[PDB]
Design a protein around this ligand. Sequence first.
Ligand code: HEC
Ligand SMILES: [Mg+2]
Length: 87
Amino acid sequence: GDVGAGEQIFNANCAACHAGGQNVIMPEKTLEKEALDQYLAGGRTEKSIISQVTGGKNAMPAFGGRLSDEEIANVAAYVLASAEAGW
Ligand code: HEC
Ligand SMILES: [Mg+2]
């Protein structure tokens, strides 16, 4: 994916709840690689991130209306790379 576009999408749509890769609303369920391993359905993969961004889960809204599939793929790439980089 395009992590540059991904970062822009993240700043506009995700950073309010996930700034610094954390999780405001559900504190343990962060975007850190270890938390993705534990708490994300399907584990630490771009595919699993795309699924959750697209459909939402619990307090996390769905982005399938607001974003295109390309935008979702790009933000997923950014999240995975940032997780691997420890935010
Ligand atoms: C606040 C209203 C949120 C916004 C905006 C976004 N997310 Fe989120 N996210 C939020 C919650 C409450 C949770 C936990 C859901 C649950 O109950 O299991 C999440 C989870 C994620 C995850 C998985 C993290 C983990 O399990 O450790 C990912 C990968 C994720 N969220 C990504 C993400 C992106 C890329 C967003 C912008 C498009 C985004 N979220 C918005 C809360 C909120
Ligand atoms: Mg679609």
